Structures are given as structure tokens and as C-alpha cells.
Amino acid sequence: ASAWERFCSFITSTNNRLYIGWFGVLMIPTLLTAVTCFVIAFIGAPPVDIDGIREPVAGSLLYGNNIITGAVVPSSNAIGLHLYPIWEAASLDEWLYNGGPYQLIIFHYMIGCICYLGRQWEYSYRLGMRPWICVAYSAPLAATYSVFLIYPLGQGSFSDGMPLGISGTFNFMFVFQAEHNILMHPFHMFGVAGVLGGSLFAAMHGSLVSSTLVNSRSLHFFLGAWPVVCIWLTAMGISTMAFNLNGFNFNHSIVDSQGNVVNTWADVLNRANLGFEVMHERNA
Amino acid sequence: VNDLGAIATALFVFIPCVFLILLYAQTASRG
Amino acid sequence: VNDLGAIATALFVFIPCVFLILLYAQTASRG
Amino acid sequence: RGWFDVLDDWLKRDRFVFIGWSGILLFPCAFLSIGGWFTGTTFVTSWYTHGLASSYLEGANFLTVAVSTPADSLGHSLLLLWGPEAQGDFTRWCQLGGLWNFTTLHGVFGLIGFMLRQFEIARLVGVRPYNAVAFSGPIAVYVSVFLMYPLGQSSWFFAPSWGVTSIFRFLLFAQGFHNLTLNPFHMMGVAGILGGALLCAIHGATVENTLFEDETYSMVTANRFWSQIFGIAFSNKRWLHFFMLFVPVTGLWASAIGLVGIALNMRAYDFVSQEIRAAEDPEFETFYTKNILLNEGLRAWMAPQDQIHENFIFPEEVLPRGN
Amino acid sequence: TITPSLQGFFYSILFGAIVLGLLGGGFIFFSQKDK
Amino acid sequence: SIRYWIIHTITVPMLFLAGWLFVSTGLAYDVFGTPRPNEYFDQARQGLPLVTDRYEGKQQIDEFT
Amino acid sequence: MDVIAYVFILACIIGLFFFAVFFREKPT
Amino acid sequence: MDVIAYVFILACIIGLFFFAVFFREKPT
Amino acid sequence: GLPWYRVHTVVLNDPGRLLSVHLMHTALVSGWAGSMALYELAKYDPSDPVLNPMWRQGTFVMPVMTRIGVTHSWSGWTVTGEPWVTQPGILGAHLNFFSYEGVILMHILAAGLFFLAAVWHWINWDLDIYYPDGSSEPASDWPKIFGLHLLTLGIVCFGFGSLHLTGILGPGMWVSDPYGLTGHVQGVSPDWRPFAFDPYNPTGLVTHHISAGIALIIGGIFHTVSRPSERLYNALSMGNVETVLSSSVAFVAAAAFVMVGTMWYGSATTPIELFGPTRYQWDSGYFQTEIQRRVQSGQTWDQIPEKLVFYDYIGNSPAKGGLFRTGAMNSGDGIARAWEGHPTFTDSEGRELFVRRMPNFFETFPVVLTDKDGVVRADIPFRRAESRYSFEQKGVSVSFEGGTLNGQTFTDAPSVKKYARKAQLGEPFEFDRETLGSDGVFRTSTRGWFAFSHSCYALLFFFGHWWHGARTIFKDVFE
Amino acid sequence: TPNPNKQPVELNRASLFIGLLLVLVLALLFSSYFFN
Amino acid sequence: PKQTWWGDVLKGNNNSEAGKFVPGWGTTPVMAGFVVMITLLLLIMLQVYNHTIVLDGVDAGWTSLGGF
Ligand code: CL7
Ligand code: CL7
Ligand code: CL7
Ligand SMILES: C=Cc1c(C)c2cc3nc(c4c5[nH]c(cc6nc(cc1[nH]2)C(C)=C6CC)c(C)c5C(=O)[C@@H]4C(=O)OC)[C@@H](CCC(=O)OC/C=C(\C)CCC[C@H](C)CCC[C@H](C)CCCC(C)C)[C@@H]3C
Ligand SMILES: CCCCCCCCCCCCCCCC(=O)OC[C@H](COP(=O)(O)OC[C@@H](O)CO)OC(=O)CCCCCCCCCCCCCCC
Ligand SMILES: CC1=CCCC(C)(C)[C@H]1/C=C/C(C)=C/C=C/C(C)=C/C=C/C=C(C)/C=C/C=C(C)/C=C/C1=C(C)CCCC1(C)C
Ligand SMILES: CC1=CCCC(C)(C)[C@H]1/C=C/C(C)=C/C=C/C(C)=C/C=C/C=C(C)/C=C/C=C(C)/C=C\C1=C(C)CCCC1(C)C
Ligand SMILES: [Fe+2]
Structure with a gap:
């Protein structure tokens, strides 16, 4: 009953309402920090110079936006990959102006996510069950790390990271499509197949069980495995596109015998990408 | 008139009413 | 914005909520 | 025993596959739809309707073949092989895009036949036909996208051409012109699909990781695990599986209502207060406004070639840019 | 007076009758065969 | 087993060649109206043959042809 | 005032989470 | 719109009278 | 529970209680009809039938009333553009009573009566009729009840077609010209020649409701007498009301x-004077073609009827x-008051060019003034860009025929730009x-709201049909 | 005469929480459009 | 079980022949023909509305309103 032993028996105990565990020891502060800063910076936060051009972009509720259009703007383009802690800032108002809250939120959130995976494993151990829920959870984890961490690393700044907002997500998707043509990348096709097929198999399994309940184990194995594998693949696809290894490109493929070019659907898709791109790229 | 006049009247009508109806319903369900 | 936007949102929030709470209360009072 | 009873028993007899009465509608229609698509990709081109090379003879790729939609001038003509357009000439029927109508209509009747088939099979086995009700969602999506949408528009030309890159063109067109991503019904559809995938994944993993060392898995351990890890858990198996059924289907139906709304240009294209506030001062910039700008750009840069029939001519001066 | 479009529709009824008749005839005939 | 092998050996390559010759002899272009690689444009007919009328589409293509 | 509507709905959601976590009827 | 508020309250009162008259629990 | x-x-x-809830639902529906019509009357502007018709004003039920006879109001005004004359003089001239308010009053009265009947049938749920001669279990014969209902509806359909629609004993129906100029409520005469199948010719409607009416009467009589067949009776489970629901x-x-199809594509039932123009009349240039031909037919521009x-x-x-x-269209671009007149644009060289009109699709369009020969002459460049074919660099005057700006000539570049945008938005107008x-x-007119709402309703009710068919066919399992 | 067909209506706690979550989430999603 | 007057009037229509059916197929063959008939009728109308079928002198459009 050493004080240290008593503490350990408290944390690694299956009688709390929510299991804490050693991974949860890191999970709780980081997640609480991320949630608190996200709430604060989503309700009210100054406009952020996303383009690093002294011109700001607002995203908070008190500055005009609603839930659909509000967001937490990524840290400024001038910062690059530099960590921007509050104590490493010239002035609080400036630190907000450069987009520090985004950095705070995403870093605490990513650490909390990986610790949450660890906590899942730990409790599976403490209860005496095979410890592979965490393996399945590793897929959406990979996806978030792709959009928030790996893509900015490949692109050199967190200004290319995903905004934390509903409309920011769509803006990110369209700019990503413009610059990398993700639709014609096979890994995203695997991901689309994964989500749609996962819904299909979920509906089929639920209908069958709920209809007759009024190797079969391999059935549930396949249920678990299919969408997880596809999400791993599409997360890897995003990560590869973060290193300028873009998808397929079939523009200007068929040419007339004399030398003219006959259009195909890929050219229409490329022209749509061209529109998205030229609307992007403020200057050149 | 007051834009909040209608809202105040509606909430005054509604809140005690839903309270009373809830009490009566959870009384009558019981034997 | 729409002056009726807030009213529509409030009634949407409230009516199903009071319905559900009433059903649960008159369920739980009964054994 | 009249001819009808003989026919019925013959249909219901066990074979490698089950035909049933539904088969009489499903198999011919499904086979014709598939054959129409294969023919349209292999041989027929869209050089006369969209001015594209969407066939293998043209030299296209598997990702660029497409049974392209009929021309714009035909409106919503059914394009029968013997109609006022084709007039019995097979080649003109193909060039005008009649293969699109052939494939889509026979697909509709194949889907109807499949739902009837599931009704019939559940009737034979003697279990609740939740499978048919589940399949009702895909039929809603199909009817909303391939029939109701082009019917609410000017012509079949605006329907999704059967393909891969053609479907991608349809997605980008919908974003550019209807701003679909901002539609709440599409948001419910996305939530339904992603939640269905989530449910499949975690249900499979849980059942695998609570297996008894021999239904067949410790429901008690699974319940406690999820309660103490996530907070909430299913304590009822029937509810668990009905929920798995319910979520993706509901997502599909919500998206279907979203798609029928945009078929009438009854689209949630913008937020009025944001437009007003942006008009007042030019400094006010949010992500929604930049999405609007992207939509303007995509419309301008895609319209001259997507809707080639309209003979749009936009010079370089009028094309929006980030200057 | 008959127009080309109406005549086409009449030929459609002919062809549809033929298709349905051949399908139904095949089904009923084969069902009767292996009684 | 063995018997059907004779029939399939005699037939399947004949069908394969049937499709092969259907493409090679240029019959497909006539059947489906698909232009020959030189038929997309003349030496200067670089305009597109797009149908503008619903009622007389086949004749208009005949003009485009 | 929209901000008040959004914040009120959100606070109600959080309260619902609190009650759904710590006050669920015991499974049995 | 005040007229609508007044008329709605009044109609609710009349409905209350109808139910209080023809649907009271029997005294005993 | x-x-x-x-x-x-x-x-x-x-x-008994099933009938009671049906009666209550009918009471609700009739009450809503009355209340909605009352609200529309209380928010209406009868002064302007031309540049502010009912469809511009967010009316929903008024066009449906007006379709088959009701036009005037007790306050006097008619929707056809004339104060109502009490042409009624005799019995069979209730027309002075059945105005909008008369219909509202009758519907509210029906709501009350149906509500009372519903209460009665709820209380007296155990009438002897619901029970057969010698079995305690209530049992109804659905086929004969269907026959009776069908016969009643056939009688009412035949009466509607032959008396009301023909105008023999009724107001008739709304008819109009191909361009929505003259709108009468006149009787129609039925014709069985094939052109009565033209959906835009009202003579079909009467011809339908007569013949179809008779078809229902026969169809009623048969089902009022004929029994079902064991085969069908067992297959469809005619003893179970759930099949009727499905x-x-x-x-x-x-x-x-x-x-929805008729509403979106237009027909004789939906005239543009009531529900507003379709979306295909703009696409096909229907009214622009008509006007251009009329002016080209020697009429001056100011002599063009403002509805057109x-x-x-x-x-x-x-x-x-x-x-x-949300709301009426006038909550959108505002209410129109005057037509500024047909504008024409000229450049420095004096060539006459035209502005390309924005299609239905585009939320915004790039303004491009092009030569009639298909060569772009001038334009408005993007929000801030340097140009070579531009509005000012080339210089453009605009001159207006008819209307408020008659004979005027704005060469002020902001004015020319404003009227260029107006011209690409159709006809310039005072809003x-x-x-x-x-x-x-x-905002969308009444026609769009109809199409959207009822397409959604149809889509949902198909799923409802599938679910109830499933619960009927699988009845032994669903318990 | 009493009606046999009367039956009570049941809704347990879990169902209440599920319903409230559905309602609140739908309200949050659609308010941003209702305010337009 | 009140023996009202209207109940006396209508009970014969309510459930005199409740649960009675004729054996076999009965009129079902005849019904078949009727269905096929309407299956043409509706079809024709659709095509007439669709401008697939063009009846002589029947211009399916707004021009047919001429005469009112
Ligand atoms: C416009 C370009 C485009 C189109 C048209 C398009 N996609 Mg995508 N697309 C997909 C489907 C899809 C379908 C079915 C589809 C057609 O219907 C499309 N797409 C279409 C999915 C397979 C896949 C996305 C699936 C997906 O969402 O992946 C998981 C990603 C995340 C963030 C999961 C988050 C996990 C976190 C632990 C959550 C915990 C925090 C939470 C607050 C906790 C709350 C708890 C409590 C309080 C309630 C996808 C992607 C993705 C992208 C991108 C850039 C795109 N896309 C782009 C497109 C991914 O990065 C991305 C990708 O692959 O990277 C992972
Ligand atoms: C008197 C002559 C006649 C008339 C006018 C008439 N009936 Mg009948 N009739 C019925 C309804 C009815 C209605 C609703 C109705 C008026 O609208 C009529 N009838 C009218 C049913 C109650 C009953 C049998 C019910 C019954 O089983 O009907 C057949 C079954 C079904 C599923 C209907 C088929 C529907 C398809 C799913 C539609 C799919 C659409 C498609 C996707 C796209 C369309 C394309 C288009 C362009 C072509 C009946 C009968 C029956 C008969 C007979 C002989 C009749 N009738 C006769 C008539 C039965 O055997 C028989 C009987 O048993 O009598 C007691
Ligand atoms: C949504 C698809 C659908 C349709 C359109 C539909 N049903 Mg059902 N349906 C019934 C009647 C019915 C009628 C008379 C009817 C057509 O008029 C329909 N249905 C139609 C009852 C016999 C039976 C029980 C009914 C029953 O229990 O209803 C209880 C419903 C309650 C307390 C509120 C539900 C909330 C709604 C959001 C209401 C919103 C207001 C309204 C929208 C205003 C617009 C009016 C109009 C335009 C819609 C039934 C069922 C049931 C279901 C389900 C899933 C459905 N349905 C579904 C449908 C049962 O479990 C269930 C079942 O049978 O399980 C045993
Ligand atoms: C692209 C996505 C997608 C595909 C390809 C798809 C495919 C399938 N779904 C089925 C079922 C289901 N899907 C369901 C829910 C869903 N289904 C979903 C998404 C899809 N479902 C989603 C997201 C859900 C969640 C709600 C359920 C509940 C079921 C089933 O019960 C059923 C099955 O049994 O599953 C195993 C099978 C139906 C078999 C059939 O009709 O044969 C008959 C064939 C016919 C009728 C021909 C159809 C012709 C089509 C419509 C048009 C032409 C298509 C071309 C030939 C190919 C074009 C390809 C290009 C576009 C690239 C088939 C494996
Ligand atoms: C005209 C006036 C109309 C007024 C409004 C009427 C409103 C009626 C009530 C509407 C709401 C009903 C809710 C019932 C809720 C309820 O009790 O559900 C639980 C219930 C359980 O059914 P059982 O038969 O097991 O038990 C029934 C009893 O518990 C209650 O009757 O199942 C369903 O209702 C099936 C559908 C579930 C639907 C919800 C599934 C999704 C939940 C999560 C979604 C939101 C989160 C998304 C995150 C991204
Ligand atoms: C499968 C796959 C994944 C792994 C790699 C691998 C290379 C193996 C790859 C396979 C690739 C290959 C070579 C696939 C070959 C696919 C093909 C072309 C299959 C095609 C079958 C063709 C069919 C049905 C055509 C049926 C045509 C029909 C009815 C015609 C219908 C008709 C129409 C269209 C017009 C009117 C007249 C008529 C007759 C009614
Ligand atoms: C009681 C009495 C007896 C003797 C005769 C007398 C006349 C005195 C009689 C009195 C009768 C009177 C005054 C009857 C009045 C009846 C009335 C006003 C009934 C009600 C109509 C209102 C209805 C349906 C409600 C519709 C509301 C719905 C859909 C719900 C949601 C809505 C839907 C789903 C569509 C979009 C809009 C909205 C609001 C979201
Ligand atoms: Fe399971």
C-alpha cells in the first residue's frame, strides 16, 4: 500500500466510470486543452492572416459567421512549420493574428488521438480480450494525421493544413483537387469503394441479423477488415500526394491522325481543375 | 410593437402549460 | 437575418423535445 | 393443376440460382442494361453530342470511356429506337445517344426487379424482408440522380453519363453550379455513409476481439469495454443490428431529398447575411466567400466546353482569376 | 390521320407483343416440358 | 470432360476471329457511325458536328456526314 | 443573436452528453 | 401579428372550456 | 407499451375508431385549407394584376381556387382586372356568395362539422354495424366498401366534368391565350376527337372527367356486386386493411x-396567369420570340402589352x-412598378450588338455584348482586370424604346454597365x-414550391408503400 | 363500455437520450439555414 | 352495440358478405385485359405528352391554347 502503488491501483482500475490508464493520463489533459481552445477560438477569435499578406480572414461566430461557414483558420503562411507557442510570441494580439490557436488545437488533438488509441489497447488488456480494436482505430487516426500533419509537412507550412470548420473542409477539398487531381488517384478510388462498400456490408449484415433473429466468424472479420484496409489506403494516398506524387493524368491523350487533338472526359475534368486553380493562387 | 412581445407571450403561454401537462400525464399513466 | 429564423429554430428544438420528455415521464411513472 | 401452377412451381424450383417471378423482370432488364453499357463504351462514341472521344475505337482508356448522355436539343425525349428521332435507324439511334436511355431505363427496371426478388425470396424462406427495405435506399438514389435530376433540368444532357471520369465531371459540375456541399441534405447523406462505415468497422473489430475461446462473443465484455472507453454502448443486440441497418439507408434517403431539391435549382447556394455583409465592406473574408469564388471560377472555366451546345464564348477578360 | 410517329408506336406494340409472347411461350413451354 | 472440348475448340476461336474481323474490316465504323481516325475532321473541317434540332436529328447528322 | 441560438443548442448537447454518460439506466 | 397571438390564446381558452365541460373525470 | x-x-x-381518426384528419385538412386561404387574403394586393399577379405575391391556394371559378372577393376586387359586377341575379347565381371568403367560410364550417362527427364516432366505437350477424369480432368487407366509395367518387367526378366544367351549371374553368394575356373563367365543351389528348388544350379535361367519371361508375357498380376471387383474395390478403393502405x-x-410533372412542364390545368411561367419558356425564348415577332410585325415597342x-x-x-x-418573390428582387423599355446597345463604330441572356443554370453570368454575327464586341471584364475588348475602351451607348426611359440615351459608363446587367437579366424593370x-x-414562384414539395412527398410515399406492402405480405412474420 | 384495444405507450431512458440527440443535432444543422 | 337506425340501414353493405370469395380465378382473366388496355392508354398519353407520338393536327405545346 505504498502511496505510489495506491496511485497506480487507482489509475489502472476497472471501477472508474471512465477508464483512465497511463495512456489516458496523457489523453485527458491534451484532449481537454484542445477542446477548450477549439470552443474559445470558434466562438470568438480575431481574423487570421492566412495568406501571410497582412490581409486577414475571419472565421469566428462573433465576427459574423455561423456554424456552416465558421472555422478555425490555419496558422499564417509566414510562420511555416515553426512552432508558435504563446510565450514565443511578440504580443498576444499578434499571436492570434498569425493563427496560433490552430497550432495549439491540432497539436494537442493529435497527441490526444494517439494516446486514445493507446488507451483503447490498455483497457482491452485490462479486461482480458484480444487487443485489436486499436488496430482498427488506427485507420481514421492515419487519415487525420494525413490532413493535419503530413500534408503541411510535405507542403512546408501549416497554412496548407485543413481548416477546423465545416466550410473550411470543403475549401480544402476543392483546393486539393485543383492542385493534385485526387479524384483520378487510385487510392482515393479505393477509399470511396471502402466507405460505400462498408455502408453496403453494414446494411446487409444488419438486415440479415435483424431479419433472422426475429466460417461465420470470418464474416465479422471481413466486416471489420474491409473499410479499415480501404481507409489505410486512402490515407496513404493523401500522404503521397503531400509529396507532389500526384495521381493519374490523361489530358491531351487522343490526337487526330493529321495532328489535331480530340477531347475526352479527362480534358473536361482538367479544365474544371484549371478553373479551381486559377481562382486560387492570388498572384503569380 | 416589441419584437420580443410575441416571444414573451409565447413562452409565458407555453412553459407553465407544458409543465402542467407533463405532471398530469405522469400522474395518469400511474394507476 | 430572418426574424423568424430564431423562432423556427426554437420551435424545432422544443416541440419534439417536449414530446419525447412527456413520453419518457409518463413511462417512468408507470412501474 | 393448371398451366399457372406448373409455371409457378417451375419458377420456384431449386437451381444454381433462384429465378422466381421477379426474374422475368430482373434478368432480361439487368442483362440489357449491362450490355448497353458495354456496347456504348466499346463502340459508340459521343463525338456528335458532347464532341468527345469516349469509346475504345476512339482510343480511350478504361477511366475515360463513357456512355454519354443524349444531345441537349432532344430535351427529355425518350429516344425510342423507333421514335421520331431514330426512326428505326440503328446508327442514328447510337449517335444521338439512345444508348444512354436504353441503359438507364433498363437499369431502373432491373432495380425494381431486384427489390421484388428480395421480397419473393424473403417470402419463400419466411423471414422479415428487412433486406428489401434496406435496398429501398439505393433505388431512391438511382431514381433521384438518373431520372428526377435530368427531368428537372433542360435535357437528359445534364444527367450523369455512365462512366468514371464522366461521373467525376458530374460531381464537379454539381459543386460548381448547385454548390451541393453546402446543402444540408447532402451533409446528412455524408454523415450516414461515413457512420455506416464506422459502424461496420467497429462492430467487426469488437466481435473479433470479444470471441469466446471455443451468439459467439461476450456481449457483456463488449458492453463494458465500450462503456468505459467511449461512454455509451449497445446493451441490446437487436437494437445494435437494426441501427446498423438504419443509419446508411437514412443517409441515402436524406441525400435523395437533397438531390431532388437541386433538380429544381431549389438549392442552398448562399447565405444571405454573408452576401450582404461582404457587399458592405470588401475586407470581410471567410471560407464560405472563397468557396463562392471557386464556384464562379469553375462555372466560368467549365461552361464553354461542358455545355458545348450553348456556343458560349467568354474571352480571357471575363474569366475570373486571382489577379 | 396516321402520322409516322404513330405508325412507329404501332410497330412498337407489335414488337413488344412479340417479345413478351416469345418470353412467356418459352417459359410456359419449358415448364410444361419437364412436368 | 472431353466431348464439349471438341465443340469449344472448333467454335470459340471462330467467335474471337469474328469480333476481330468485325473491327479490322472497318465494319464497326459503319454499324455504329463511329468516325474513322481521319473522319473526325477533313483537312480543314475542324468544326464540331453537334446536333441543334431534336426533330430532324438523323438528317442533320447526314448533313454532318 | 444567432450566436446565442447556436451556443444554446451546443450547451444543451453537452448537457445531454453528461446525463447520457453518468445517468444511464444500468444494462441488465 | 398581435391579433394572431390574441386570437390563438382565445381559441385555446375555448378549447379548454370544451374539454373541461365534456371530458371531466366523473365525480365520485 | x-x-x-x-x-x-x-x-x-x-x-369505428379508425373512421373517427379519418374524420379528424379530414377536419384538420379542411381547417388548414380555410386558414391558409384566409391568411393569403389578409396579405394580398389586388391593385396590380399586371406587374404584381398572385404568383409574384407568394400565394399558394389562391391559384388553385381560381383555376375552377373563384375570382372575386366580397370586398369587390376581381383578379381578372375589373371590379366585380353582380351579374348574378337569380338562383343558380350563388356566384356572388362563392367568392374567396365564401369558400373560406364553407371550409371552416366543414372542419367544425367533421371534428364533431369524429368525436361522436370516437365515443360510440361499438355500434352494432361494425359487427357481423353472429360473431363478436368486428369484421368489414373491404371489396364492397371499395365499390361503394368508388361509385360515390364516380358520381361526383361525372358531375364535376359535365356540369361545373362545361359551365352548364357551374362557373366553368380558367382558360387563356398562348401568352397569358386574357384570362377567363368560361365553360368548356367536350370533344372525343384525338386532339383532346393534347395536355395543353382544356377540352381534354372535361372530356376526361366525363368519360373517366362514367368509367368509375361502372367500376363502382361492378365492385358493389362482384365478389373477389379466391386466388386474388388470398394473394392480396383482401381481409386485411393493411393491403388497402399499401x-x-x-x-x-x-x-x-x-x-409534379404537369406543374413543372405546364399544362391546361396550370395556366401561367395563375401559377406563373415555367422554366422552359425562358429557356426556349418563348416570350422573347413572341415579342420580337410582334414588334417585327410593325407594332411599335411602346405598344407591347406589359404582361408579355x-x-x-x-x-x-x-x-x-x-x-x-423564404417568402413571396417580391421579398426578393422587390415589387415591380414600371418597365424601363427595350434597350439597344451600340459601340463606337455604330454597330448594333446584343447582350447574351443568362441561362437558368448560372447564379452569376459574365456580361458579354456580342455582334449579332457571333463575334464578341465588348464586355465587362472581371471585377478588376485589364482588357482589350472592354466597355469604356470601346465605348457603348444605349437607347431605350418605349417604357419609362423612352428615347433616352445613357452613355455614362456606370449607367451603361447597370443597364447591361439588367439586359442580361431579361427585360429592364423598375423594382x-x-x-x-x-x-x-x-425567389421561386408558386409553381416551383409545388413541384419541390410534392416531389419530396412522392419520393417519401414510395418508401411508405414498400414498407406497408411488406407488412401486408409478411403479416404472419411481423408479429 | 371500455375499449379493449387501448394500450399504453412506452419510451425508456435510452430512447429518450437517442431522440434528444437526434433532435438537437438536426436543429444545430438546420438553424444555420433557417436564419439564412 | 347500439342498434341505431343508420346502422340498420347500412349493416348489409358493411358486412353481409364479409369474408366471401368465389373459388378459382373468377373474373381475374377479364381484369387482365383491362389492365393491358390501360397500360396502352397511359403509355400513349405519355408519348403524346413526350412528343414521341405526334398526332395529326395536335401540337402538344402552348400554341394549342389558341381558341380561348
Ligand atoms: C472534391 C474532391 C473530392 C470528391 C469529389 C470526393 N472526395 Mg473523398 N473521401 C472519401 C469518400 C468519398 C466518397 C464516397 C465520395 C463520393 O461520393 C468522395 N469521397 C468524393 C473517404 C473514403 C475518405 C474520407 C473518409 C474519412 O472521413 O476519413 C477519416 C477522417 C477523419 C478526420 C476521421 C476522424 C477521426 C477522428 C479520430 C475523429 C475524432 C474527433 C471527433 C471530434 C470526436 C468527437 C467525439 C464525441 C465528442 C462525439 C475521403 C477523403 C478525401 C480526401 C480528399 C482531399 C477528398 N476525399 C476529396 C474528394 C481525404 O483526405 C480523405 C482521405 O482519403 O483521407 C483519409
Ligand atoms: C368494371 C370494369 C372495371 C373498372 C372500370 C374497374 N375495375 Mg377493378 N379492381 C381493383 C381496383 C380498381 C380501381 C382502383 C378502379 C378505379 O380506379 C377499378 N378497379 C375500376 C382492385 C380492388 C381489384 C384487383 C386488385 C389487383 O390485384 O390489381 C392488380 C394488381 C396490381 C399490383 C396493379 C398493377 C400495378 C403495377 C404495380 C403498376 C406499375 C407501374 C409501372 C412502374 C410504370 C407504368 C408505366 C405506364 C406508362 C404504363 C380489381 C379487380 C377488378 C376485376 C375486374 C374484372 C375489374 N376490376 C373491372 C374494373 C378483378 O378481377 C378484380 C377483383 O378482384 O374484383 C373484386
Ligand atoms: C415515411 C414513409 C412512410 C409513409 C409516407 C407512410 N408510412 Mg405509415 N403507418 C401508418 C399509417 C400510414 C398512413 C395512413 C400513411 C399514408 O397516408 C402512411 N402510413 C404513410 C399506421 C398504420 C402505422 C403506425 C402509425 C404511427 O404509429 O404513427 C406514429 C407517428 C408519430 C407519433 C409521429 C411521427 C412524426 C412525424 C414526423 C410527424 C410530423 C407531422 C406531419 C409530417 C405533418 C405533414 C402531414 C403530411 C403531409 C405527412 C404506420 C407505421 C409506419 C411505420 C413506418 C416506418 C412508416 N409507417 C412509414 C411511412 C411503422 O413502423 C408503422 C407500423 O405500421 O408499425 C406497426
Ligand atoms: C457505387 C456504389 C454501389 C454499387 C456498385 C452497389 C452494388 C450493389 N448493391 C447491391 C445490393 C445492396 N446495396 C445496398 C445498400 C447500398 N448500396 C450502396 C452502394 C452501391 N451498391 C450503398 C452506399 C448502400 C447503403 C444504403 C443493400 C441493402 C443491397 C442489397 O441487398 C444488394 C445485394 O444483394 O448486395 C450484395 C447489389 C445489387 C445487385 C443487383 O441489383 O443486380 C441486378 C443488376 C441490375 C439490376 C443492373 C443494374 C444496372 C445499373 C443500375 C445501371 C448500369 C450500370 C453499368 C452496367 C455499370 C456502370 C459502371 C460505371 C458507372 C463505372 C450490387 C452488388
Ligand atoms: C405535427 C407535430 C409534430 C411534432 C414533432 C413530432 C416529433 C416526434 C419524435 C421525433 C424524434 C423521435 C426520436 C425517437 C428516438 C428513439 O426512441 O429511438 C429508439 C427507438 C427504440 O425502439 P424500440 O422498439 O427498441 O423501443 C421503443 C421505445 O424505446 C420508445 O418508443 O428506435 C427508434 O425510434 C428507431 C429510429 C431511431 C432514430 C434515431 C437514430 C439515430 C440517432 C442518432 C442521430 C443523431 C446524431 C447524429 C450525429 C452526427
Ligand atoms: C475483371 C478484371 C479485374 C482484374 C484484371 C482483369 C484484366 C482480369 C479485368 C478484366 C478485364 C476484361 C478484359 C474485361 C472484359 C470485359 C467485357 C467487354 C465484357 C463484355 C461482355 C459484353 C456484353 C455482356 C454485351 C452484351 C450486348 C448486348 C446485350 C446488346 C444489346 C443490344 C443494344 C445495346 C442495342 C439494341 C440491340 C441489342 C441487341 C438489344
Ligand atoms: C369547432 C366548431 C363546431 C361547430 C362549427 C364551428 C365552425 C363553430 C367549429 C369551429 C371550427 C374551427 C375554427 C376550425 C379551425 C380549424 C383549424 C385552424 C385547423 C388547423 C389547421 C392547421 C394545420 C392542419 C397544421 C399544419 C401544421 C403542420 C402540417 C406542421 C408542420 C409544418 C409542415 C410539415 C409543413 C411546413 C410547415 C410546418 C409548420 C413545419
Ligand atoms: Fe453481428
């Missing part, structure tokens, strides 16, 4: 789809609205927003 989504099954086995829901969904030019505005199209842009605080963004 029952789950919240099955609470109403407690009337499945009780014919089939009825399917029928109603099909009806909704057909109605209002129809050529794109703000009237039902395909320019939004899902959450007021100060009265209503209008938002400048468009």
Missing part, C-alpha cells in the same frame, strides 16, 4: 409524381430561386425594395 412509432395501431382492429399509398405517390414583357423577365423563372430563400426590405436575391 407500444413504441412511439406504433401508437396509432390501437385503431387497426377497431373500425395500395392507396402507392396510388397517391403516383398521383403526386404526375401532378413581364413574362420575359428572368426573375419570374421558377428555376432561379433557393431552398431557404422597389424599400417597401419590404427585399434582398435582391431571387
